[PDB]
Amino acid sequence: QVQLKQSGPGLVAPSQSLSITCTVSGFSLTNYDISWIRQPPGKGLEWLGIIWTGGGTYYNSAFMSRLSISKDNSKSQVFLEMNSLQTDDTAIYYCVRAGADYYGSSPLAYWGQGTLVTVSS
Amino acid sequence: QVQLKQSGPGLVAPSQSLSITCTVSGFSLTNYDISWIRQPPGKGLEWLGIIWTGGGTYYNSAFMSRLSISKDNSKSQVFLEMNSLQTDDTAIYYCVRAGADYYGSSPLAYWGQGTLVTVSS
Amino acid sequence: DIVMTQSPSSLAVSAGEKVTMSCKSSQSVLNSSNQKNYLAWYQQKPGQSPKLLIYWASTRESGVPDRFTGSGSGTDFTLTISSVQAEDLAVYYCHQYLYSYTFGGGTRLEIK
Amino acid sequence: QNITEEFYQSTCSAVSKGYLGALRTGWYTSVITIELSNIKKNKCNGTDAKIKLIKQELDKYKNAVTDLQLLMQSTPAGSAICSGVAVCKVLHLEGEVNKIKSALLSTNKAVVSLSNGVSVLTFKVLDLKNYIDKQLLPILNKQSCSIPNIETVIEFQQKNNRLLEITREFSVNAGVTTPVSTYMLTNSELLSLINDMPITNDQKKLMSNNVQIVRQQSYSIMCIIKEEVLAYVVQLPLYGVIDTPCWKLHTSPLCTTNTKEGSNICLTRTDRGWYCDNAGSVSFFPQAETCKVQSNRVFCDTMNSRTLPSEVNLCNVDIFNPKYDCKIMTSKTDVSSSVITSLGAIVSCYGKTKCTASNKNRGIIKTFSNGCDYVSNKGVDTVSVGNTLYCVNKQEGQSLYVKGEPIINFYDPLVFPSDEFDASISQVNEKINQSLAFIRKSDELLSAIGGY
Amino acid sequence: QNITEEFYQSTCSAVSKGYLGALRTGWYTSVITIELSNIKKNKCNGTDAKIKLIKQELDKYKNAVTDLQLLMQSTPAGSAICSGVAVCKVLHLEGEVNKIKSALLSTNKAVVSLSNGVSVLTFKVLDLKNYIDKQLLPILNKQSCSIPNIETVIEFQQKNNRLLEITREFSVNAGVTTPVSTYMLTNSELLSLINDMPITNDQKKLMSNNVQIVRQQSYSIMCIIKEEVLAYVVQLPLYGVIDTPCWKLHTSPLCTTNTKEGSNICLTRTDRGWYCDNAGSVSFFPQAETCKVQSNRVFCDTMNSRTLPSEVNLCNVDIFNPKYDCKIMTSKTDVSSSVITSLGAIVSCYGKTKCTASNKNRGIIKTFSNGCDYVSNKGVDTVSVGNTLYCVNKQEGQSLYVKGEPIINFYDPLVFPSDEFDASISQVNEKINQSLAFIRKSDELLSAIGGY
Amino acid sequence: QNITEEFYQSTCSAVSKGYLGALRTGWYTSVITIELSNIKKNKCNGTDAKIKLIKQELDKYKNAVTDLQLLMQSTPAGSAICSGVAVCKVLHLEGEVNKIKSALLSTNKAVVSLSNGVSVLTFKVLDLKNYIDKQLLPILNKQSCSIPNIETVIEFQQKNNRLLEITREFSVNAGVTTPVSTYMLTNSELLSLINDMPITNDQKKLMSNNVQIVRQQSYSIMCIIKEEVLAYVVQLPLYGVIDTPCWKLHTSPLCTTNTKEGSNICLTRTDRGWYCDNAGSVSFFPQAETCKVQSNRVFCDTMNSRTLPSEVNLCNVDIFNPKYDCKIMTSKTDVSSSVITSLGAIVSCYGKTKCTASNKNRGIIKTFSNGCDYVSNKGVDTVSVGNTLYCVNKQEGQSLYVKGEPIINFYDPLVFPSDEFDASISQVNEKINQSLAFIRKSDELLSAIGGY
């Protein structure tokens, strides 16, 4: 089987930096893309960038100035960090997966357990 | 005919630098390798580096840190210099010749007249 | 480096007899490029610089006497003096110049 | 994902399988602009060594500007430079450079629509105008030439350095440089540009995974130096297809095993090279230079490819398939030769030439017979034929040896054609038919001779 | 100026006329010299990192000098190197370097005559001897070894940088570098050198108009490092002909329109390439790499050129003219292909391959039929054949379409030759006749069947 | 030493002699390593210009490291790498980088045995880790962040410059860069590598005499970047044969002297190129690009060579010897052309073309007749054919002219073959016999017209 474990604080004061780590198990990071989706309470999901198999990233245009996604292959870990977090950014963060350069990839199949983030002082 | 004439002092204080020069006549330095061979008293001969036709050198692995051989084609001269000379290095020095890359050569035919070197203070 | 081992250390003999010295190489001295053997026999008279006697274990240097003509193969070579002479009282070295330059101990000849 | 080489002794050809190629089918032009300063007159008087160095750097900058103006005089400097040339001419029209300047004033990146009707992304890599006017221009204007900080000079040099390296690479190449160096476009800037490109997510992922091939396939065209703007078009590739099934075909001569010299007829499949799937048709790449190969993905370039119907694939597994006509070459030279494939080596030995296969630890282990035979890549690390030495690669993957009767056997050497560079199975068949027709015409001639 | 590209459907070949070419037919060699310093011993004893940097730069200079000495040991390193080699050997003679050394002690340019009887200009681009001996040599000589200013170190590095880059280029290129970089000869120095050449005013003007082509056609041969002089021969081209009428010829395959495979006979004129007028004869350039093009002005190199009688001109407008015998090839492969001319494009479609011509705003606008057809460059912007894509260059000028019956029609497929490379119309007229003679004698044979 | 260039007017072929040879038969891969520092976080809070420059240099270093990591992602990046990539994956195995890192701690050069069973020499060219950790890392760690002096910034730039240029070359060349630049391996370090290579002393001497050819034949494959190590395999050549007697063969077309067009049959021996002696067999080099030529030693590369039996040499002095069957080309084009040999030139004139030989002072001195004729290199300095011009090299050596009847005379033009890429005397004579059999059959037919 495969699994994703999420670590790091959820609550953060406004206009600070929020960090989080998704540690994977059951597959090689050098073969699986790892996105980061966000669900505000009582609202649908929205995309918050991605980091490819080669280490490159494609941030969302709205958060491109604050979002930051990194990856380490040896530990099989992914790191997400956001800056200048404001009240609107309270949500639940999921370190969802992806597949290959094909449709038959199970686009967003195995999602993390989900980490709540309440942005308040 | 061909000949080699050796100059420079032979006696030197220990842990000093000893210089020596071999001037060739009867052949072009740009065609003949000019080795340098050593003979301690009451002992056989031993190798002390060489400088090729193209100016490059291949020092002895034990003497590579101190031995220095140079040459100049115009005056047809070869220079040898050793550093940190100690008591064990008292010997007889020969600026011996060589041939070509092909084996069909006299390996060490025309040796110098021999320069004695007594390392003492 | 390849180490030369020449025997005997000393070889006393009387004039007109036969003298044979044997030199052994630690590793093969044959060259695969030119198909030759890079060993040379040198003779050093007392108070004199060494004189090239033989290279290739067969060919002699120009101007050397014909009484010295050794032979050998692989890692074993021998120098033989057909007619020992009174003025041929010298120390003889076997030398390799394939992968580096090294010399033996020196076979000593004394007339009697 | 797993490469399965298959060697067919029927033609003794090695076809690899399971490649995930990505054909290049388009270009995208980014107008990379640098903001120069139109400074030509020096007014301050200073004999200091630092001032002399600053003036020397400014002279180098002016000479670079003049060289770029000469390159513009060389401008306009298929499908490789057109859109670069097209943007070069558009920027020459009045007001276009001004609109680029106005759009890029606010941000280092923008999307600008020009009079030609095409909108392109413009990237301000270096702002030399701001540095020149704000830092060294005030010192150069005042009569004191007050420079108490050496570092600025070095900083200036650094800021100037890229431009010089931009000019130099231009000057030797007359305004068309490939591959795009790290001076035309930094890898960080290139990666940031790939995200602003109007493409799918798959294309961004593909060209972010393999960024070096993007540089190898890219271009940089001098366009215009004017109005304190140095604009060159970086023409990045565009991969319309991604992860398509691609496979390579290596071919080796197949000659008769006859010991007597003269009866050697060699049949080599000429469709050697790469094949990819694209829009239901096979893109064939004969030249081995165009298709770069990464670990498993065969990046290619349809700039010189040939479209073919799908049944050409059926020609690989079936030589005599009626669907497609395979291309072969008939020659007489039976020189022993070997080709190192991805998962082994094909070795063809004829005449008195010797062929050996050796491992690092076991030494020589195999001796090759007459004909073309294939050796795997594990347990055999080198192959020496005659005096030449081809090293067998150590790539990991399944390899299959297929027992096949040589196709040269069913063709009679007497009627077999010679030195035919490119042919076809039906083409050689009809050549044989015409030769046999001549044969039976001669038979009719001797029949008439016997009867009369 | 007015490029009148005429397309002939008789052979479907596009001839672009009205080019003002400038052939090159010789070289002028300048002995570019750098004054070095024969410094080998350092007497400085200083642990300061500035003195360490000075010593490191001096060590780099010494290693560059040693590398140049190795390159001289490589010296001497058609018509490409002869003049450089000849001056290389002359400078090796005793005193020949000394006269150049003693002739430039007052000026940076002079024409010196050597023992070979040739007088050449000797530019002195860099004077490193003066800087080394007057600035850092006094610092090294004194036991204090106090470097006064860091800008002295920076200036030393900047001056030495040209020599280091020259050494790097020579080492990687083994002493012969082309195109001449801006380190061997700056564009300002090259422009000043063109004015001192002993040539016409037209040659100087043409060279000053196109300096980039001069660099592309130039050379820089390392000659000698000796007597505190590093001399390399920069041999610039020489254009003995200027504004001659030059024209290009592009050819495309012409095959039968039959859809059935095997009946397509392809003819393609092999005289493609450039043609120029020179001394009453036509200089023919078969490959297009030699003849660069810049704004209707073509620049050509005569080393690969072939002289031809003027009558070859009427070959272009009349392939059956008895004055000249043009060159063609006969092949069987009828692969659809496109060739991009100067004012349009020729596209040959056969079999089931599809060919389209499209404008960027109107989409697909034209569909091509079987055969070779030509399209202009205005109103049509792209041509896609099968899966591959080609342009049409945006060059402006009159383009003429000439209605011509395909010459392949008069050539019967049964007697048409195959896989030919460099045949000719008079070459291909009797081997067919012999073929019919082969028929005729075979016409006797069944007559021998009939009449006995 | 004495180059005895002998020209044979029989086939008008020029064979040089007296050329020593140094064939390349092996590779020696040295793991050149650079000690990087794994620094990713900057703790400085200073806004000084020197601190800004330091941060810029560190950012350049980090971007270079990231580019090298991308190049590693391109790794493994045909023996030219087959032996080179075998060390890359060995270094990828756990602990294999650590053993090199530990062994090279004491000395900057050491022989290290790896898990593959092969021991290779490792050389620490640049210790960037020590410089970064000991000099600028303490400055970064402190909150003050005060650079001691700008000379530290300049030294950091100079040290990082080699790594930046290494990364630039790797990025533009995707890792495999050739020739090995002076940034990959300095000439002094290359000489030390040759000295410490285990080889015959003759090989050490030969490599020390010609280091430029060593660089031209070398390679530099990017292997790995990991564990604060940057390892690239520099695989130097290995010359197993030295001073072997080699010889060149230049061939020129030999066509009929008839002025009437169409009757000219051209014979040109196709075995042109270099030959060398090696282990009792002749190594033939089809093209002249592989065999670099020094003053007398023709360094070569057996990676493309072909082994041949010894008696092929007897082909040069006797083309009709039964020992070897030489290679020729039978064409029809009789274009006048010249080939410049080492000690003169062969000039072939046919038709109405004119050929002249001229001297610098005496002017034009000789006019060439129909056929191929050879002119020496002393007394003649230039040869002009038609409108094109070549030299004759002024190399010093004996040249022998041999009177030989044209072999093309013995071949009848009617039965002579055409456009044959590579024939042989046995092949030509057997096809001549076949054509004569055909004419004999037609004679049998015309006789069968009678007889009855």
Side-chain angles (χ1 to χ4, degrees), chain D residues 150-152 154-155 157-159 179-183 186-188 191 208-209 211-212 215-216 261-262 293-295 332-333 335 340 352-353 360 381 385-396 418-419 438 442 445-446 449 451-452, chain F residues 25 48-50 52-53 56-57 60 63 67 70-71 73-76 78-79 82-83 89 116 150 154 157 165 168 170-174 278 281-283 302-309 419-422 427 430 438 441 444-445 448 452:
Chain D
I150 165 69
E151 44 264 25
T152 84
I154 331 179
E155 166 125 4
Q157 176 199 340
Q158 295 303 302
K159 300 290 306 293
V180 169
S181 100
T182 66
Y183 281 124
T186 317
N187 243 348
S188 87
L191 286 167
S208 165
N209 281 355
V211 66
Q212 293 295 344
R215 288 190 172 287
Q216 305 307 299
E261 176 81 40
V293 182
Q294 202 114 335
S295 67
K332 306 296 276 182
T333 83
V335 46
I340 304 288
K352 66 220 86 50
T353 326
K360 170 60 60 193
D381 308 351
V385 160
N387 286 158
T388 187
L389 183 124
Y390 308 137
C391 181
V392 165
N393 44 13
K394 286 312 241 175
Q395 165 94 0
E396 328 85 23
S418 166
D419 53 23
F438 184 23
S442 184
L445 296 166
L446 298 58
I449 289 162
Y452 287 93
Chain F
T25 38
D48 179 29
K50 264 179 289 184
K52 289 187 165 179
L53 263 165
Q56 286 160 30
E57 301 266 10
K60 292 172 69 49
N63 293 130
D67 204 350
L70 288 162
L71 294 149
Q73 264 152 43
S74 186
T75 57
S79 171
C82 181
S83 79
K89 28 201 76 282
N116 206 5
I150 173 59
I154 312 187
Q157 196 270 288
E165 301 299 327
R168 193 178 331 285
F170 278 152
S171 321
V172 303
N173 283 322
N278 190 359
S281 297
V282 190
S283 298
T302 40
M303 191 85 108
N304 330 86
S305 74
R306 319 193 303 108
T307 202
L308 280 177
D419 60 43
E420 168 64 40
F421 169 70
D422 199 335
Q427 285 156 16
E430 72 197 64
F438 184 23
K441 290 147 39 166
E444 293 145 28
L445 302 166
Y452 318 102

Side-chain angles (χ1 to χ4, degrees), chain D residues 219-415:
Chain D
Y219 264 99
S220 170
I221 308 139
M222 197 29 172
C223 261
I224 164 175
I225 189 192
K226 177 199 189 186
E227 274 171 277
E228 314 170 352
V229 152
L230 151 71
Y232 46 101
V233 160
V234 163
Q235 188 148 249
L236 289 171
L238 255 175
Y239 297 108
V241 201
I242 301 182
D243 283 28
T244 165
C246 297
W247 73 85
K248 190 167 194 167
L249 178 52
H250 331 80
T251 62
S252 174
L254 157 65
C255 322
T256 44
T257 55
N258 285 330
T259 75
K260 44 173 181 294
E261 176 81 40
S263 295
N264 291 117
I265 39 157
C266 302
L267 193 146
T268 312
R269 280 258 209 107
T270 73
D271 52 349
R272 147 188 333 115
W274 280 100
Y275 287 78
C276 281
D277 279 321
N278 181 14
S281 300
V282 194
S283 294
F284 165 54
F285 300 70
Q287 280 159 237
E289 156 71 20
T290 168
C291 279
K292 327 291 174 191
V293 182
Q294 202 114 335
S295 67
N296 206 163
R297 309 173 174 283
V298 200
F299 288 65
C300 286
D301 185 6
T302 36
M303 185 149 269
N304 34 77
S305 72
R306 317 199 296 105
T307 199
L308 283 178
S310 70
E311 90 264 9
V312 70
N313 179 27
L314 317 172
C315 214
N316 220 345
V317 309
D318 192 12
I319 172 63
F320 271 57
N321 64 318
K323 317 271 211 163
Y324 199 87
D325 201 348
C326 274
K327 312 272 116 171
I328 72 193
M329 169 189 354
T330 78
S331 297
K332 306 296 276 182
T333 83
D334 58 321
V335 46
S336 302
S337 61
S338 320
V339 39
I340 304 288
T341 89
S342 199
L343 298 171
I346 320 156
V347 159
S348 62
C349 312
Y350 319 96
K352 66 220 86 50
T353 326
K354 66 106 186 159
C355 324
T356 89
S358 89
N359 187 236
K360 170 60 60 193
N361 75 72
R362 254 168 62 76
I364 283 85
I365 57 186
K366 192 180 302 196
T367 293
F368 297 87
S369 318
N370 269 22
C372 34
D373 291 330
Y374 164 72
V375 51
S376 73
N377 96 96
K378 41 212 172 182
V380 174
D381 308 351
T382 326
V383 162
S384 313
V385 160
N387 286 158
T388 187
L389 183 124
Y390 308 137
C391 181
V392 165
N393 44 13
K394 286 312 241 175
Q395 165 94 0
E396 328 85 23
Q398 185 273 340
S399 168
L400 169 61
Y401 200 113
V402 188
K403 308 291 168 301
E405 42 274 355
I407 49 188
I408 198 75
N409 184 28
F410 333 103
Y411 304 143
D412 171 63
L414 305 178
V415 291

Side-chain angles (χ1 to χ4, degrees), chain C residues 21-57:
Chain C
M21 43 272 290
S22 67
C23 184
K24 280 141 80 62
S25 86
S26 325
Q27 307 151 25
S28 171
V29 189
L30 194 87
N31 232 359
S32 189
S33 78
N34 38 352
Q35 248 314 358
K36 290 266 152 297
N37 198 304
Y38 287 50
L39 195 126
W41 287 98
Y42 299 90
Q43 153 183 184
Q44 208 225 5
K45 297 176 172 54
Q48 267 191 14
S49 292
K51 176 188 192 178
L52 161 46
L53 269 198
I54 283 174
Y55 44 89
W56 164 228

Side-chain angles (χ1 to χ4, degrees), chain F residues 16-168:
Chain F
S16 306
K17 296 294 284 186
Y19 272 113
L20 302 176
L23 300 134
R24 189 212 71 79
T25 38
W27 293 101
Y28 179 82
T29 72
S30 171
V31 182
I32 307 304
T33 85
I34 312 184
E35 293 300 329
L36 312 178
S37 187
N38 285 357
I39 289 307
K40 294 175 176 60
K41 149 71 170 193
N42 46 78
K43 316 136 288 297
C44 266
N45 216 1
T47 63
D48 179 29
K50 264 179 289 184
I51 311 303
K52 289 187 165 179
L53 263 165
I54 286 280
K55 279 182 179 177
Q56 286 160 30
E57 301 266 10
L58 211 29
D59 293 325
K60 292 172 69 49
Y61 165 59
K62 293 179 193 173
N63 293 130
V65 171
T66 322
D67 204 350
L68 293 167
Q69 277 162 355
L70 288 162
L71 294 149
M72 191 205 178
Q73 264 152 43
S74 186
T75 57
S79 171
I81 48 193
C82 181
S83 79
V85 314
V87 186
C88 295
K89 28 201 76 282
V90 159
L91 288 152
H92 285 96
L93 306 191
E94 163 60 81
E96 296 300 308
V97 161
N98 274 313
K99 61 172 56 167
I100 286 186
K101 193 176 183 180
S102 296
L104 287 177
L105 174 55
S106 323
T107 89
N108 276 1
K109 182 143 42 70
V111 193
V112 159
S113 200
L114 303 173
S115 294
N116 206 5
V118 50
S119 318
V120 281
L121 171 54
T122 63
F123 199 165
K124 259 180 50 186
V125 281
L126 195 47
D127 195 332
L128 259 158
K129 163 165 154 205
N130 201 32
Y131 178 53
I132 288 171
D133 300 14
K134 287 203 163 184
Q135 306 278 322
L136 53 101
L137 174 132
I139 301 301
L140 258 56
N141 289 354
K142 305 154 196 169
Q143 286 293 310
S144 52
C145 278
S146 177
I147 272 296
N149 170 356
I150 173 59
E151 62 197 63
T152 72
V153 181
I154 312 187
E155 190 174 5
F156 184 29
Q157 196 270 288
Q158 286 303 125
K159 299 280 305 298
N160 212 294
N161 169 228
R162 174 162 193 189
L163 169 62
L164 295 176
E165 301 299 327
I166 286 167
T167 320
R168 193 178 331 285

Side-chain angles (χ1 to χ4, degrees), chain D residues 67 82 116 171-172 307 420, chain E residues 182 212 216 360 387 391 419:
Chain D
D67 204 352
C82 325
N116 208 5
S171 312
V172 298
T307 199
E420 180 61 46
Chain E
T182 65
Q212 297 300 338
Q216 305 307 299
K360 57 169 197 157
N387 287 161
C391 283
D419 62 17

